[PDB]
Amino acid sequence: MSLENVAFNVVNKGHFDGQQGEVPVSIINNTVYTKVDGVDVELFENKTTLPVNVAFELWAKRNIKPVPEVKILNNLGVDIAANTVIWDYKRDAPAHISTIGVCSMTDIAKKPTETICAPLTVFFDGRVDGQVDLFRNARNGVLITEGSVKGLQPSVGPKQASLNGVTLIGEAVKTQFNYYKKVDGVVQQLPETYFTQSRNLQEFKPRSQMEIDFLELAMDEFIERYKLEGYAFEHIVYGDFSHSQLGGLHLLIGLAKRFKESPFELEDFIPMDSTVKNYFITDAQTGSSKCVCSVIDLLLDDFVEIIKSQDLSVVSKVVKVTIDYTEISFMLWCKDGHVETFYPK
Amino acid sequence: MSLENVAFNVVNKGHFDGQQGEVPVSIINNTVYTKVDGVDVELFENKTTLPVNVAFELWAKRNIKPVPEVKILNNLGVDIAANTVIWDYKRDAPAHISTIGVCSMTDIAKKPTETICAPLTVFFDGRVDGQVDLFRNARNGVLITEGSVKGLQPSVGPKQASLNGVTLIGEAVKTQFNYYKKVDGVVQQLPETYFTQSRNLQEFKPRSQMEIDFLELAMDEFIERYKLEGYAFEHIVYGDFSHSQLGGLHLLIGLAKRFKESPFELEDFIPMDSTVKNYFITDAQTGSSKCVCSVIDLLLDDFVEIIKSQDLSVVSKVVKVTIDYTEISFMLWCKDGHVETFYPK
Amino acid sequence: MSLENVAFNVVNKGHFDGQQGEVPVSIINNTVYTKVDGVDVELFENKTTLPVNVAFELWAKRNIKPVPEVKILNNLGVDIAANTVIWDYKRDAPAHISTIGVCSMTDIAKKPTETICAPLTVFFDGRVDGQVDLFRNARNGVLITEGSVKGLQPSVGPKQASLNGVTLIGEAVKTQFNYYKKVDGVVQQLPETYFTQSRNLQEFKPRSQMEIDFLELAMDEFIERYKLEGYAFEHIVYGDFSHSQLGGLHLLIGLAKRFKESPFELEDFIPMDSTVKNYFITDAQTGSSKCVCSVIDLLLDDFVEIIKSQDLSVVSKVVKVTIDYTEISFMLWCKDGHVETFYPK
Amino acid sequence: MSLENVAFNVVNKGHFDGQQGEVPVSIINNTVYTKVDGVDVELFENKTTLPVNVAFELWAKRNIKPVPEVKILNNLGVDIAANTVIWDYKRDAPAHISTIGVCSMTDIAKKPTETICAPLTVFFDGRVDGQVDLFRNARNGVLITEGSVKGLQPSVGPKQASLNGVTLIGEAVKTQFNYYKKVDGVVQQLPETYFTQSRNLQEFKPRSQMEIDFLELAMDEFIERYKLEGYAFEHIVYGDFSHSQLGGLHLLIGLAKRFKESPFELEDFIPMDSTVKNYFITDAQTGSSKCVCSVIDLLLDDFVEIIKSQDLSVVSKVVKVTIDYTEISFMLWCKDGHVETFYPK
Amino acid sequence: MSLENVAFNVVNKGHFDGQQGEVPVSIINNTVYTKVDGVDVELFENKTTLPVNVAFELWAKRNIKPVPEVKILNNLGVDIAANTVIWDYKRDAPAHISTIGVCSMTDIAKKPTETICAPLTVFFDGRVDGQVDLFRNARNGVLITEGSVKGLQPSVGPKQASLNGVTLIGEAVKTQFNYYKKVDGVVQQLPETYFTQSRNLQEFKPRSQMEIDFLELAMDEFIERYKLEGYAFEHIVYGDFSHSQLGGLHLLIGLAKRFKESPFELEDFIPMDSTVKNYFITDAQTGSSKCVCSVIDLLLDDFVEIIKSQDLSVVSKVVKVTIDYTEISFMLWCKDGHVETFYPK
Ligand SMILES: O=c1ccn([C@@H]2O[C@H](COP(=O)(O)O)[C@@H](O)[C@H]2O)c(=O)[nH]1
Numbered sequence A, B, C, D, E: 001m002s003l004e005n006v007a008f009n010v011v012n013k014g015h016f017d018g019q020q021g022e023v024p025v026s027i028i029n030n031t032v033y034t035k036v037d038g039v040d041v042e043l044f045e046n047k048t049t050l051p052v053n054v055a056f057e058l059w060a061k062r063n064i065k066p067v068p069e070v071k072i073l074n075n076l077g078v079d080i081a082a083n084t085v086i087w088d089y090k091r092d093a094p095a096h097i098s099t100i101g102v103c104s105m106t107d108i109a110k111k112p113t114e115t116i117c118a119p120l121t122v123f124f125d126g127r128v129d130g131q132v133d134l135f136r137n138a139r140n141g142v143l144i145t146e147g148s149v150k151g152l153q154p155s156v157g158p159k160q161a162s163l164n165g166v167t168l169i170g171e172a173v174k175t176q177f178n179y180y181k182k183v184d185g186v187v188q189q190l191p192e193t194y195f196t197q198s199r200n201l202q203e204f205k206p207r208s209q210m211e212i213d214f215l216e217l218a219m220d221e222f223i224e225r226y227k228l229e230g231y232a233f234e235h236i237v238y239g240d241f242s243h244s245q246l247g248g249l250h251l252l253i254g255l256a257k258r259f260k261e262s263p264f265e266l267e268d269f270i271p272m273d274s275t276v277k278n279y280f281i282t283d284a285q286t287g288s289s290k291c292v293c294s295v296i297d298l299l300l301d302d303f304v305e306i307i308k309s310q311d312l313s314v315v316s317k318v319v320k321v322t323i324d325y326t327e328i329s330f331m332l333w334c335k336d337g338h339v340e341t342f343y344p345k
């Protein structure tokens, strides 16, 4: 292993591919350059808190197959990955602080069977040879596979996965994984869970007829068709832009509908991958704004199921919803048997 | 006050909100990070010339209500703000070098009544309690209010204001201010003035029928309808792209019309907020370019009034137009009683 | 806890003392400044690989009582300290990567009784209340005390200790500790050991009559008086400067004698605290030099005991000597029953 | 003015001398280089908080004649210098944040007669032509001269001054100045004052017979000869190294006597020029140490006068002594009519 | 070749030694670290203008045998070295900008026989096999050897050379070289030359009886013994400290004599190796100072020969003296047949 060999692979293979060779490398400030035909070409700018030459090596060795989105791994308590780097593209940094068998500066072990790895919840990838059996022996672990594992009940994960920073539902490649988890040598039954949909504002695409209806129909028409009167969708989902403080607007599909008609600014003041996102939102059309607007991307059909499964008889309470394998707390406010607002915290 | 408490407020409230608490903070190079669930998340990248921890505190304490655009405050001679930070989003830096009662590293005073503040033109905000009366006592000051001030004649400011970096005409919030100014204890009569419209190229929206006509009609049709023959609109407003040096094109609406049909590059080589902007422009379609193209965004109706109020009998002269409370100099070139060009300097 | 409060303590108490207060702080590049009467004064320059604000906090909280030299702790396998920072003054950095109950960015636990601390060999300091009993309960640990511990046999440590970076034999303060060690809940019997003396070239002071004799007597006289003929002291201790490659010179006292008569340069190319030190040495008088000259500071009486306890009948072999609780390997070369050279590796 | 012209003067004249010319300059990180015969030579490393090219210009234009030590100017309330830079060699930075007529980035005025300079206490140097008369007209100012000023009573300053960072009593050049001060146009009578002597530990030289006696005589002999029994010189001046906490040792001459016999470490944790200095002291011989040891360098004859002019009848009190034109507070502790300790704060 | 292999050699061999291996390396800012037993140890701090990883490689590959001082190579017009790095310890940087066969980022050729090397004056080292014959074939070159070269007349170089930054007259190693030079394929006759002695102030040691006499005798006694009256040694060599501007003092031995009696400060404002050095000198005893004091270190016997070989009949003139193979210009000032001053420029 060598910095110059890593650069050679990046230049010739697009990432670290284990090829032999070296190229000349310059490091100046926080950027790595290589000399290409007499001129310097930037290969990598370190945006991490690691040393530039270390971040470069971890970046070059990132996993380039579809992998679980980082929010899923965090929610499952994954501490470290077995013999790979999960690159966190939202943070432009490794998803995990340490490595196993990846890099001499960051390795805590060469193999996940060493004792130092035993207390950590290690992520194992059943697509790599041998890792399923390592999971059967590991004390703490999470395993994904594309198919069945003998003697283990799977929990079916989300349909989408991350490929080189692109979140997608795979058609030429499988992105739908079974999930398994062990704690202290004991296989866990992962809970029934909803999954977030991981869409974004500018390219929001509906994924069900109900979501199509939400984008196509007027507000009162949609709530009428699906008999959603009294659940405060006008506030919660569509948003209330009538006052200086922006009311509601907590579901991504609701932001998408407003955005497609009228633009607004979202300051992502904690920029990481998480099931619930908090934005400093400023509506450009009205001047309505809100410092902390919590936003979750559930499939609209799923959100309706959740809200229709709540008792509306109490002024305020916390509602727990298992999402992405974690319990998300929602604030439910009601008045006279109707929803006033309902937002994730 | 404390760096870690500022970070706590940013993480939990989107900005500094006076809440008690602390979170762990890392500073590496010119970026501030906080540790969130075992990983570092970037909270702020310093693009200012202040120390990173100082810029972070001023940024977190920026004013998040609608405030006058920085170009107005500069034109009014404002030196410093009373108990707030005006963040200059065009420069990504504070609009003013010093503060009053904001930050221990940058404070020159805790209250604007101290003698050190007397010679400075201090900006007071009548929406904050007590500040109107501070203005009545201050030696040098500018005061904005949303309504009347007893015994003071107001100057009506622009319709738009800046909210979290978004320039807008408020509908749910008031952005139209009265302006007052004192110099050496004496209230000034602010001059009659036009106002720039603060629009941008990509999202340019007409704001009058004349501007609608400009975008909808052909060049000769528009000049004919409003009887503008001989005022060189073909050159000044529409632009002349026939030669290697780009001719004219000095009004934003004229750039907008060309841009909507044909893209071009504008290098903003002095990136700050100012009434007149200078761009290094390169027309992609023709290759016509100009190193310094001065561009002003007046409402088209206002620009027509201005140019029709000039004598066209002289080869060249400087025309003074009060705009944004400042005197803008225009170059007027005429030949045989017609305009040849007319551009701001 | 807060950066500004740490700076307040540094300015007012010389280190972190738990006092309430704050001062204004600036961070620019890798240096921390505070404003003192209108000007900036540097408080700390980060020479560590930690973030500047983190290194500053660990530095301010360094232990300022006599503590074991870092080489002893390393040799004893200490991984982390209980509720203190051992500052490594040779590296100008913390001696240990993590902390317990010191600093939010670096803490792995608030108390050493947490499970995450169990596999680490934690250093406990019996001078601090409660820590002896924590040692009795800890799974892995090293404990120093100034006196007896009930039911535990002590190993008497070196006479000297480090106080604010000053290695000294205490007269007004106790620097002589008893040592105890536990591995997996079992108290260890620490081995019989020599100790290095931790002296330096420029201020080398003899500590026994034999060392006095070495500095005072001529080479042949000293070897004769203590009947050291055939042990190659002429080479090993005095040094051989007759060839382009410097021969021998492996004991600090031998460097001291040459240095007091004739100066030379020692490049400390791995600058850390360790029992054996390696120097790139250049003799200024002769031009004799050697890239790797291993140097150990044993009391001369101790080194004579060691070398007189070796068999000299073999051409070459590795000799193991327990020093500072670790086994130091020496290379022993002999010819015709006499030493040729003998140096630590 | 130009960066490259400044570098030309530095290379050819040792400082800025107003010569015409330019040399090639490179700025990389915080260091300025120039190319000299094909290689880069470092000219200046910025240790200030100013921009590297700005600090370089102020450094090159530093005053290279004898000037008052910075501690005197600070004590006199000087805010800024007229047409010069006082370089603060203890901080390796300008003594004053702003300049007058020195540097375009830092100038607040070109001449001290401008209104912006009126509220500042401006330092004027009577050796420069015209500055005495500027002082007669300035509202706030301090003036030094080498001789009489018509109609103004002088206060005789210290014998020593700073020349290129060297504090000296001039023999070939005059370092003894008259001082004058104006506040709001009114000449002040500067108070009777002692002066500190500005000596250092390693090169401490006695400057009176009493100081000679202190270094030459034994402790009891000296106190006896000058009849100083009961004034706790044994504690205050000689120092008490018998306990873990170092007792007393508050006069530089007392540190000098110990240091000449036995070395110790002084951590200067607030590194600036000031009348009273605070050190984190560790005595190497005994291990006695103290986190905050306040140290003042008075001429011993002066300190005896001060302490013999105090009432010793009270347990504890604050004693005010005018020194370097400022009031220094001393803590006086007495028991049964004798001094227990007496130290500056 | 590889960064990590270079670090391995540095850690294990003190410099680059061609050994196989790798160690983990971190680069942060301008410093290279390696992890040694769980902690980071600084290996190299870049003070050059090259990229940190490039400077590190050139530093590790520096020549560690005695080599000509850089001032000699510069004076001989050497542009580049054949298959080695001459490290310039005065500048802490490579003596030459480019390399031949050393480092991929800096190499301009792998062998000096390539056409790109033909116009450069390449330094060849006859101690390395094959390089003498390369010199016979090179178009432009300088060759040093320890002995005779067939068919070439040598010029005997200085007695001293640089070994790892230590300038010395070798006793165990040869530092006295023959010099040869070729320009456009033609061997040059190097001129008769004096050599500077390369001594320093603090450790100045006389090297002849005349120099011994200078240090031992009083000023008038020495000038009398060697009949030097009228050559202004009182001014030129001893220095004149009677006025605010320091007079004379242009020979290092003269600085040494003053320094041994009385200290002064020398600011080396162009820090590089050169035959003539310019210092900003401040005399601590008198306050006499001079911004540009040119200082040359000739053996006193040599300087007397030079000055006694000048005509003293003219007010002022430039005197050319071949020194270190270059022509040094001296200013000679005379009055009434005696020297007034005589200093190098
Ligand atoms: O985690 C949070 C906290 C607040 N809010 C929004 O901020 C306001 C909180 O009001 P209050 O409960 O502080 O009165 C509401 O508009 C709510 O939608 C969120 O979206 N998420």
Ligand SMILES: O=c1ccn([C@@H]2O[C@H](COP(=O)(O)O)[C@@H](O)[C@H]2O)c(=O)[nH]1
Binding pocket: B246, B247, B248, B290, B292, B293, B294, B295, B343, B344, B345
């Ligand atoms: O402040 C300026 C200066 C120049 N120009 C443009 O640059 C050219 C100036 O020509 P001249 O007056 O230098 O000949 C014209 O095309 C004019 O529109 C501007 O827009 N603004």
Ligand SMILES: O=c1ccn([C@@H]2O[C@H](COP(=O)(O)O)[C@@H](O)[C@H]2O)c(=O)[nH]1
Binding pocket: C246, C247, C248, C290, C292, C293, C294, C295, C343, C344, C345
């Ligand atoms: O760890 C080491 C390795 C080598 N040397 C010195 O370097 C030389 C090693 O020679 P060799 O055994 O490589 O032939 C000897 O002078 C020896 O003293 C040391 O001091 N320490």
Ligand SMILES: O=c1ccn([C@@H]2O[C@H](COP(=O)(O)O)[C@@H](O)[C@H]2O)c(=O)[nH]1
Binding pocket: D246, D247, D248, D290, D292, D293, D294, D295, D343, D344, D345
């Ligand atoms: O400004 C200060 C404060 C304390 N000390 C020293 O620190 C100790 C203060 O003790 P106490 O008054 O806090 O008990 C004494 O040894 C005293 O000499 C100083 O020198 N200067």
Ligand SMILES: O=c1ccn([C@@H]2O[C@H](COP(=O)(O)O)[C@@H](O)[C@H]2O)c(=O)[nH]1
Binding pocket: E246, E247, E248, E290, E292, E293, E294, E295, E343, E344, E345
């Ligand atoms: O290259 C130089 C230039 C000047 N000086 C010194 O500076 C002064 C130059 O005076 P002047 O010839 O500028 O009058 C003299 O003291 C002279 O010794 C040098 O040493 N070297």
